Amino acid sequence: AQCSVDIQGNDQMQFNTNAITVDKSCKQFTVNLSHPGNLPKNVMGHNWVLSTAADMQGVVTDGMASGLDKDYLKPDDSRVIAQTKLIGSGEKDSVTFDVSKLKEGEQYHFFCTFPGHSALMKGTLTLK
Ligand SMILES: [Cu+2]
């Protein structure tokens, strides 16, 4: 069984997927984020952040207020189920999280919190 996904965030402010499914039989799930392109992190940095859909807008708003020095994520945000760091182009970051943290009968979204990106870089995450 597959318990990981590889996702690209590129210089056109896009994730290459907007829907991720996690098999409920995985104990852990790994997101491998890569950022192809040629822009530095301070122009077009991308992260991958998972929260409930109801928490998403707040996560994003608080992350932009947190600023570039904090990867545009509030530190220790307890609305964040899992996150990569912010990466510039040519970089990669993976996050692994326990599938036991997703609730059956909750809605989840992933997104990038770099300012403005979540209009395009957002998607759903579901248990299969
Ligand atoms: Cu981004």
UniProtKB/Swiss-Prot annotation:
Primary localization class, coarse: periplasm
GO cellular component: periplasmic space; plasma membrane
CDD domains in UniProt: Azurin
Keyword vocabulary terms for this entry: Copper, Disulfide bond, Electron transport, Metal-binding, Periplasm, Signal, Transport
Disulfide pairings: C3-C26
Residues in Plastocyanin-like domain copies: 1-128
Subcellular location: Periplasm
Gene3D superfamilies referenced in this protein's UniProt entry, alphabetically: Cupredoxins - blue copper proteins
UniProt GO MF annotations: copper ion binding; electron transfer activity; identical protein binding; transition metal ion binding; zinc ion binding
Amino acids binding Cu cation: H46, C112, H117, M121
InterPro entries, alphabetized: Azurin, BlueCu_1, BlueCu_1_BS, Cu-binding_ET, Cupredoxin
Keyword Amino-acid biosynthesis: no
UniProt function note: Transfers electrons from cytochrome c551 to cytochrome oxidase.
Record's protein name: Azurin
Protein encoded by which gene: azu
